[PDB]
Amino acid sequence: QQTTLYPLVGRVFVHTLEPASFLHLPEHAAPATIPVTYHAHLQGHPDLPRWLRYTQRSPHHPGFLYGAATPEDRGRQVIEVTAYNRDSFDTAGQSLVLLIRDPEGSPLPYQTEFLVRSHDVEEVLPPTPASHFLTALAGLWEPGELKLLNITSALDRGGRVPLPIGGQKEGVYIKVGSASPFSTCLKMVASPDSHARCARGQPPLLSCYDTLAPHFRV
C-alpha cells in the first residue's frame, strides 16, 4: 500500500491521518475509540528530515505529519511509517511518496508570523480550523490572497509549559504568505511606538477591530 502526495516549496503541507484505511485491520463499531500512535521516518532512517515533523495530542486523537518543503529537498522522497496501535499492538507498515516541486504562480514576499494563545497546535492542524483562521486574517488582509507557510509549536521555539488550570494553551507560531502588501493597520502595528508600549506592558496601538476575536486570541 502506497500513496503519492505532491508538496510544493514555499507553503505548509499537512496530512490528516485516519486509522480506517491506514491500518490493514479495520476498526468496526466506533472507530474513534481505539488509540493508535504513528511513527514516521525516512526510508532506511530513524527520523523525518528537518523540514518535516510529527505531533499527536493524545493517542485517542489523530496524529499529524506536517512541515514546509525546502528548495534543497526538491525531488522524490520516501516515507516509511508504522501505525503502532497503543492497544492492539498491530504493525501496519506503510509507504508515502512525496514529490517536492516548485510552487506555481506569483511568489509571496509579504510573510506574516503570529502567535496564537487560545489554541493548541493539534486544533489548527485539521483543515477547517486553519481555514477559519485564514478567513479571519483575510478579514483584515483586504485586499489580497492568502496562503499559510509554516506551523510550529510555541514549545519548540522555547516556551514553557502552560498551567493546566485556567484554560491556558501552549500557543502556536503561524507563518502565512501573500503577495499583497500589509494593511495600514498592520503597518501601524509594526511601528516602534507599539513595540515600546509592549515593552512597558501597555497594549499596542490598534486601529482595526480584532476579527480573530472571540474564537482566536493572538
Partner 1 sequence: TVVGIPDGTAVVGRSFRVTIPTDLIGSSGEVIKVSTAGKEVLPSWLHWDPQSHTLEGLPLDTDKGVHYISVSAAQLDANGSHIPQTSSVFSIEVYPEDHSEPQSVRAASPDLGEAAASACAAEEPVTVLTVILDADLTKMTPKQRIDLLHRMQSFSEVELHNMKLVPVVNNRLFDMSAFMAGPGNAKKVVENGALLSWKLGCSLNQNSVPDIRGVEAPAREGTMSAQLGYPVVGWHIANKKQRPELKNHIDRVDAWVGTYFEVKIPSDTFYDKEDTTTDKLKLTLKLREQQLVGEKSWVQFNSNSQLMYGLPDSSHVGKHEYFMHATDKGGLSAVDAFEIHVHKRPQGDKAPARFKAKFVGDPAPVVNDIHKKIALVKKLAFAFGDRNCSTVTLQNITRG
Partner 2 sequence: KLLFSADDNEVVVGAERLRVLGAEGTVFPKSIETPNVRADPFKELRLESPTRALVMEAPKGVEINAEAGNMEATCRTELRLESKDGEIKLDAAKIKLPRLPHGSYTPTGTRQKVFEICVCANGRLFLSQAGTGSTCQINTSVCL
Ligand X SMILES: *[C@@H]1O[C@H](CO)[C@@H](O[C@@H]2O[C@H](CO)[C@@H](O[C@@H]3O[C@H](CO)[C@@H](O)[C@H](O)[C@@H]3O)[C@H](O)[C@H]2NC(C)=O)[C@H](O)[C@H]1NC(C)=O
Q: In the complex, which residues of this chain contact partner 1 (CB under 8 A)?
A: 25, 33-34, 60, 85, 87-90, 160-165
CB 103 within 8 A of CB 11: yes
User: Does 158 participate in binding partner 2 (rule CB under 8 A)?
Assistant: no
- 132: part of which helix (H) or strand (E)? helix 127-138
User: Does 35 participate in binding partner 2 (rule CB under 8 A)?
Assistant: no
The minimum distance between CB 25 and partner 1, in angstroms, equals 8
User: Does 175 participate in binding ligand X (rule CB under 6 A)?
Assistant: yes
| Stretch near partner 2 under the rule CB under 8 A, chosen from 42-50, 63-71, 138-146, 200-208 | 42-50
Which of residues 1, 3, 16, 82 is near partner 2 by CB under 8 A?
82
Question: What are the E-state strand segments in 26-183?
Answer: 36-42, 52-55, 64-68, 75-85, 93-100, 110-116, 147-153, 172-178
Pick one of partner 1, partner 2, ligand X, none as the site partner of residue 149 (Cβ within 5 to 8 A by kind).
ligand X
Residues near partner 2 (CB under 8 A), total: 15
Q: Say how far apart CA 37 and CA 39 lie, in whole Å.
A: 7
User: Does 86 participate in binding ligand X (rule CB under 6 A)?
Assistant: no
Q: Say how far apart CA 64 and CA 126 lie, in whole Å.
A: 9
Number of CB atoms found within 10 A of residue 69's CB: 24
- 131: part of which helix (H) or strand (E)? helix 127-138
Output the CA torsion 154→109→16→115 (10° steps).
Answer: 20
Q: Draw the binding track, 178-197, toward partner 2 (x: CB under 8 A; -: no contact).
A: --------------------
CB 97 within 8 A of CB 147: no
Give the residue with the Cβ less far from partner 2, 53 or 175.
53
User: Does 34 participate in binding partner 2 (rule CB under 8 A)?
Assistant: no
The minimum distance between CB 68 and ligand X, in angstroms, equals 4
The minimum distance between CB 44 and partner 2, in angstroms, equals 6
CB 78 within 8 A of CB 42: yes
Burial of 109 (0-12, 13-18, 19+ CB in 10 A): exposed
User: Does 78 participate in binding partner 2 (rule CB under 8 A)?
Assistant: no
User: Does 46 participate in binding partner 2 (rule CB under 8 A)?
Assistant: yes
**Which chain residues interact with ligand X by CB under 6 A?**
50, 68, 149-150, 152, 156, 175
